[PDB]
């Protein structure tokens, strides 16, 4: 995974936890959009965000993100057990000339 | 609504050729902006893009595996076929077929995903 | 086949006045009823002249469009315009875009003048959203199609301001791309080609224009990129240059300098022969006069004292207002000849009582007699 | 030896429209298939007119090039232009050059207009890499040789922008010296000398030009020096001045002000006599019309909403697009007279059905009759 | 009021006049008093943070 994400982040219930997806001048810096996916244990990936913040049908408004240069962030407000999934970022790389995914991060709640 | 189903052998011997087929409903590969892509996820590992085919029949493959991969589509039957050659134990992973939107940008996203068909190489 | 005669009749309104806010009309919080209209120099003024019936046909052989207000230059802006950074003389690489990076920006407008005269309403072209959906899926946020639309220009429609003749209402959804006076309107530009092709010349038998503009500043946008720059055209950077800056650049117009010598108004016209088959005949006893004049678009601010019990100055004791004064005076010379539009908003002008053959008693008549 | 007659025929397209991105064409990540073409005012437009056969020869005695879009000024830039520092009014000595010191810079372009008419394709001169290798070793990074090349101008080729008529693709390898729209293209300039020398006048029997420019800023480069400054021309410094600054200076052009009075278009021409032997005869039933007009090169930005579920503004919810509207309308007057190019990309224009002798029904015909 | 002074049929108010005036915008400025006719909510999207206060 050319894109890098922290292996895991822990947050308390109801707290605003954040995730990071660092890139480079070839994937994120070049202006290619970034997308996110959540995958529950034993299920297929589900679309979460599709241009840095946008929210598809069926996702609570508590999910958002922003562009911070050669990086992107996912923000979760009101942490619950629904957020015990694995999150992946996706983008396009011009050098490798492929679509790439990140290393994934295992969000956990201190219940 | 729009759905995808995967099918294929769950066990394939090494150095053989794997074949997988997907069936999609609710959309066609003739509408501009509609595309289908193949992804895989080895156990306890991150997702990895493999290939992609679009309405104009243009095909895309991963550079690390371009020679081993070929894809095709059949609009009249709403099916897309993947074929990987020279299999290896490392390739044992779950394969998902997903629909894909075309952007004016080049960073496409796969909104719906299939159930996922597991493949083992041994 | 039209026979001309030596009978002439002078006419005119002698005054036409309008007042209102230049940016947006005033009205109650949710009511759609207007209290103060919107009046500015960026709006077309289409005067639908209702001539008297000669049988109880006219031929407009001369016209004069008087303007009374002093020369001036209007200013328009947007409290939340989309402007990332100035790139004319950037000395350090742009650092952050942020969630919202809109700035309070102001700017003058492309100076423009015109005067269209004809027996049919004028025609105006703009760039609106296209019809063709065919067999292409409209993906989230794709580029809207473009189409060359043709319409009829009405009084109150905006003019081209150097941002392009386009329907900002639909093509731009963020409402921050252009100043407040056009962020939700249609900036049309006359389709001179079609209006002179029409073989009859009804749409107009006389027109003038004089517009000018220069780039006063160079600016950049801040939205997410659409058609990204090809990797071929640049070498990937690193460090500070790792994150590309937006390549969507827009100019800020400027009309330069206003002068009396560059005025087409307060000057007579003589429509002896038109550029079309029709030689100025007023079929149906009607006329249309479309005029634009950004050379007198000075907005006079008004200040009113809420309380007069303060020894010292306080911003929380005065209310600021903006109003625009529009003054007009149409004069016409008509010649005697022997041989469905209610959908639109025009400025009706009745002339069925203001006809007199005493040419010398009026200035335009004196000029006509001299020439 | 060509006999003229009193037979005339008006012709024209009545509309010619184009749309696309002004900087670069759109296409799939690695595919070379274009989805949206590249259209801008900096490109030549060569219309290859396919006349009908008079025997089933023509003489172009008049032409009119209609332009419909509003006047405006385009803006071009480069997210990673090579620009070390501004030296117009430097008050402190430059400190560091660094590994990468490129800045997001924008700039308008030299205003230019032209209209070449002839029976053969036009000729354009630029400055490309020279052929002669002879007996000289090309050392690493040596200065490429320069040669005065001659070519044929095609539709889509760029025009001189004040950076010089040169082949930026080869002469400049870093792709950061000039804006994005020319960093990988050829900016040709017509070779008027050769095209009038040709004794026949086939390459053209009429031409016009009006271009202007001024220096709006003074900039410096940052690459490693080539031909270093001689030690004779300066006294060695010390301290802060110990490290010389680059002596490679480039200007940023500017076209100043656009006006209607400075327009050569929407105005008829009368080619009664050419500047060559040929007096406007259309040999082979063909014509070429090359036109440039940077006076209407306004780029209209488009904004599309990805999601409409946000109460507040967010840059990550709108996509920015740039498109350019190019409109044309060619009119011709032809006179009757009695007595290998498929390699290039031209804008084919068919006129074999649009010939009519009803001159008065068209504007150009009315003008011709008047004159 | 050139219009009224030439309308008058006698020309007494004047029988000769000239004028030559010119102007250009040298700077763009803003006021600071309390707002009167406020901007409609239709013409803009509400901001936040720094842009919270128009």
**Contact call for D26 and B104, based on CB within 8 A:** yes
State which residue of chain B sits closest to A91, comparing Cα positions: B107
User: Least CB-CB distance to E47: which of C102, C184, C254?
Assistant: C102
C134: Cβ contacts below 8 Å, ≥ 6 apart: none
CB of B46 within 8 Å of a chain A CB? The answer is: yes
Mutation to test the D interface, candidates B53, B102, B104, most D Cβ within 10 Å: B104
The 10 Å Cβ neighbour count of residue D160 is 23
Q: Contact A103/A7 with Cβ under 8 angstroms?
A: yes
> CB–CB of C84/E44 below 8 Å?
no
Check E33 against C257: CB less than 8 A apart: no
Nearest CA in chain D to A60: D309
Burial of C135 (0-12, 13-18, 19+ CB in 10 A): exposed
CB contact (8 A) between residue E22 and residue C66 = no
Cα angle for residues C60, C64, C65 (degrees, 5° grid): 120
Termini Cα distance of chain E:
40
Distance CA C307, CA B66 (A): 79
Q: How was this structure determined?
A: cryo-EM
Integer Cα distance of C180 and C80 in angstroms: 9
- For residue C169, the surrounding DSSP H or E stretch is helix C168-171
Q: Does D314 touch chain A (CB under 8 A)?
A: yes
| CA quadruple D175, D176, D177, D180: dihedral sign | positive
Sequential DSSP letters for D239-277: GGGGSPPP--EEEE----EEESTT--SSS-EE-SS-SSS
Tokens representing C256? 């330069």
Q: How far is D310 from chain E (nearest CA, A)?
A: 10
Report the chain B residue with the minimal C-alpha distance to residue A43.
B115
Q: Is there a contact between B107 and A101 if contact means CB atoms under 8 Å apart?
A: no
In sequence order, the 6+-apart residues with CB closer than 8 A to the CB of A67 are: A28, A34, A52, C97, C224, D315, D316
Return the number of other C-beta atoms located less than 10 Å from residue B111's C-beta. Answer: 17
Distance between C125 CA and the closest CA of chain B, angstroms: 27
Q: Which residues of C touch D302 (CB under 8 A)?
A: 143-144, 146, 171-172
Enclosing H/E stretch for C258: strand C257-259
CB of D77 closer than 8 Å to CB of D107: yes
B-chain residue closest to A95, CA distance: B63
Contact C189, C159 (CB under 8 A): yes
CA D207 to chain centroid, in Å, comes to: 16
Torsion of CA C229, C231, C232, C235, to 10 degrees: 110
| Distance between B59 CA and the closest CA of chain A, angstroms | 12
CB D316 within 8 A of CB A72: no
Alpha-carbon distance D161 to D178, whole Å?
10
Q: And the tokens for B35? A: 């595309």
CA–CA gap between residue D96 and residue C12 (Å, rounded): 71
Q: What's D192's DSSP letter? A: H
Residue C126: closest CA among C175, C172, C160? C160
Residues B58, D31: C-beta atoms closer than 8 Å: yes
Nominal resolution in Å? 2.7
For residue C246, give the DSSP letter.
Answer: P
Block residue for tokens 């108010």: E13
Q: Provide the b/e sequence for C154-189 (b: ≥16 CB within 10 Å).
A: bbbbbbbbbbbbbbbeebbbbbbbbbbbbbbbbbbb
The burial class, CB within 10 Å (0-12 / 13-18 / 19+), for D24 is buried
**Cβ atoms of residues C208 and C264 within 8 Å:** yes
Q: What angle do CA B41, B44, B49 make, to 5 degrees?
A: 20
Cβ neighbours of residue C202 under 8 Å, at least 6 residues apart? C118, C119, C120, C276, C278, C283
- By Cβ distance, the residue of D298, D315, D323 closest to C223 is D315
- The whole-angstrom separation of Cα C124 and Cα C149 is 8
Cβ-Cβ contacts under 8 Å, C229 against chain D: 23-24, 79, 180
Alpha-helix runs per DSSP H in chain D: 168-171, 192-197, 363-370
Reference C350, options C13, C67, C10, C9; nearest CA is: C13
Is A52 part of the contact surface with chain D (CB cutoff 8 Å)?
yes
C chain contacts of residue A25, beta-carbon cutoff 8 Å:
236-238, 241-244
Q: Are D347 and D340 in contact (CB under 8 A)?
A: no
Give the three-state DSSP class for C233. Answer: helix
Name beta bridge partners: D46. D290
Tokens standing for residue C318: 């005065």
Find which of C132, C134, C138, C139 to mutate to test the B interface (most B CBs within 10 Å of its CB). C139
Q: How far is CA D73 from CA C293, D293, D295, in A?
A: 21, 10, 6
D299 close to C162: Cβ distance less than 8 angstroms: no
**Which residue does chain A place closest to C241, by CA atoms?**
A25
For residue C48, what are the CA distances in angstroms to C57, C212, C282, C347, D199?
17, 28, 12, 6, 58
CA distance D22 to D41: 8
Question: Which residues contact residue D286 at a Cβ distance below 8 angstroms, ignoring those fewer than 6 apart?
Answer: D48, D49, D50, D51, D119
Helix, strand, or coil (residue C230): coil
Token digits of residue B62: 């991963």
CA distance C331 to C62: 8
3-state class (DSSP) for residue D203: coil
Is residue C322 classed exposed, middle or buried when 0-12, 13-18 and 19+ CB atoms within 10 A define those classes? Answer: middle
Q: Using CA atoms, how far apart are residues D302 and D323, in angstroms rounded to an integer? A: 8
Q: Is the minimum CB–CB distance between C238 and chain A shorter than 8 Å?
A: yes
SS3 C85: coil
Q: Give the burial string for C280-319 (b: 16+ CB within 10 Å, else e).
A: bbbeebbbbbbbbbbbbbbbeeeeeeeeeeeeeeeeeebe
């Amino acid at each position: 995974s050319v894109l890098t994400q922290p292996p895991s982040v822990s947050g308390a219930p109801g707290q605003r936890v954040t995730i990071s997806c660092t890139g480079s001048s070839s994937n994120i810096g070049a202006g290619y959009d970034v997308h996110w996916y959540q995958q529950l244990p034993g299920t297929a990936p589900k679309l979460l965000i599709f241009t840095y913040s946008n929210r598809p049908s069926g996702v609570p408004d508590r999910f958002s993100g922003s562009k911070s240069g050669t990086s992107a962030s996912l923000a979760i407000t009101g942490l619950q057990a629904e957020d015990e999934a694995d999150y992946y970022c996706q983008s396009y790389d011009s050098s490798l000339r492929i679509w790439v995914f990140g290393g994934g991060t295992k969000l956990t709640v201190l219940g | 609504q729009v759905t995808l189903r995967e099918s294929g052998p769950a066990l394939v011997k090494p150095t053989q050729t794997l074949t997988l087929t997907c069936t999609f409903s609710g959309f066609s590969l003739s509408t501009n902006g509609m595309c289908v892509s193949w992804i895989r996820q080895p156990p306890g590992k991150a997702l990895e893009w493999l290939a992609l085919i679009d309405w104009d029949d243009d095909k895309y493959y991963s550079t690390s595996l371009k020679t081993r991969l070929t894809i095709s589509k059949n609009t009249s039957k709403n099916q897309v076929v993947l074929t990987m050659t020279n299999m290896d134990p490392v390739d044992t992973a779950t394969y998902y077929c997903a629909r894909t939107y075309y952007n004016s940008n080049w960073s496409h996203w796969f909104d719906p995903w299939g159930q996922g068909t597991l493949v083992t190489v041994s | 086949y039209v026979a001309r005669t030596n009978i002439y009749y002078h006419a005119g309104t002698s005054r036409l006045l309008a007042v209102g806010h230049p940016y947006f009309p005033i009205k109650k919080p949710n009511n759609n009823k207007i209290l103060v209209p919107k009046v500015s120099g960026l709006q077309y003024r289409v005067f639908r002249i209702h001539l008297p019936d000669p049988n109880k046909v006219w031929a407009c052989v001369g016209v004069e469009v008087g303007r009374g207000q002093p020369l001036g230059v209007g200013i328009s802006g947007h409290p939340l315009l989309n402007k990332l950074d100035d790139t004319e003389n950037a000395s350090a690489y742009a650092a952050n875009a942020g969630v919202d990076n809109r700035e309070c920006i102001s700017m003058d407008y492309k100076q423009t003048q015109l005067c269209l005269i004809g027996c049919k309403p004028p025609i105006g072209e703009h760039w609106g959203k296209g019809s063709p959906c065919t067999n292409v899926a409209v993906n989230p946020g794709d580029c809207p199609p473009l189409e060359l639309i043709n319409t009829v220009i009405q009084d109150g429609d905006m003019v081209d301001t150097g941002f392009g003749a386009m329907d900002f209402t639909t093509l731009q959804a963020n409402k921050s791309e252009v100043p407040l006076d056009i962020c939700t309107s249609i900036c049309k530009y006359p389709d001179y080609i079609k209006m002179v092709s029409e073989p009859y010349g009804d749409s107009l038998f006389f027109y003038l224009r004089r517009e000018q503009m220069f780039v006063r500043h160079l600016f950049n946008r801040a939205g997410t990129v659409g058609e990204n720059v090809p990797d071929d055209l640049y070498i990937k950077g690193s460090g500070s240059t790792a994150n590309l800056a937006s390549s969507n650049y827009f100019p800020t117009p400027s009309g330069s300098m206003v002068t009396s010598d560059a005025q087409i108004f307060n000057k007579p016209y003589w429509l002896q022969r038109a550029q079309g088959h029709n030689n100025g005949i007023c079929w149906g006893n009607q006329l249309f006069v479309t005029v634009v004049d950004t050379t007198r678009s000075t907005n006079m601010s008004l200040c009113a004292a809420i309380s007069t019990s303060e020894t010292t100055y306080k911003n929380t004791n005065f209310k600021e207002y903006l109003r625009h004064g529009e003054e007009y005076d149409l004069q016409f010379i008509f010649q005697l000849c022997k041989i469905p539009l209610k959908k639109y908003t025009f400025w009706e002008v009745n002339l069925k009582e203001k006809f007199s053959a005493d040419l010398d008693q009026f200035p335009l008549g004196r000029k006509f007699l001299l020439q």
